[PDB]
Amino acid sequence: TTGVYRIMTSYQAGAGVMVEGVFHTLWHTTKGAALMSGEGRLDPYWGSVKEDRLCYGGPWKLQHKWNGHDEVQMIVVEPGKNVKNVQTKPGVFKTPEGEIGAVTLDYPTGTSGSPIVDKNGDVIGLYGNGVIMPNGSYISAIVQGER
Amino acid sequence: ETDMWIERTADITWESDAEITGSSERVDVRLDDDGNFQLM
């Protein structure tokens, strides 16, 4: 069922989103372990360790990306708490393959895989693969690929 | 056997009342082959 999910193992290992019958998360939250669900066991369909992305049940369905103009929201899936959204204007990680939108939001480990959404409520990527700055501040990429 | 599972918790939506927070930083990074971003 389409929506935002917690990944459990009890304690929360991460989060992700079901869209068009496919479950999407960061690779590192499960490392490709199968996932039990209300619809039976889900098996990893495609994953990239380099990109830290993983989907179950079929190919990557998330087709939208940050437009480079607008603020975005993270649906923060904090362990032990109802979800709450936070809004921010991304900066960027500057890499050779183009800029990647990046958010200065610092939440607990159980939150990796929480979705980032645009104003239309479309998922433009996931939280939780980034860098620690020399001053200790955390910045995550908006982690995304093509559908 | 796996010891992991998923639990649905919320709709995918934009919240009109969300707190605005954070900053727009610009940082040079490379992504290594095991998926770790590295500061440059």
Binding site: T109, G110, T111, S112, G128, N129, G130, I132 | -
Partner: peptide, 4 residues
């Protein structure tokens, strides 16, 4: 650290 670098991931969440």
């Amino acid at each position: 650290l670098k991931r969440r």
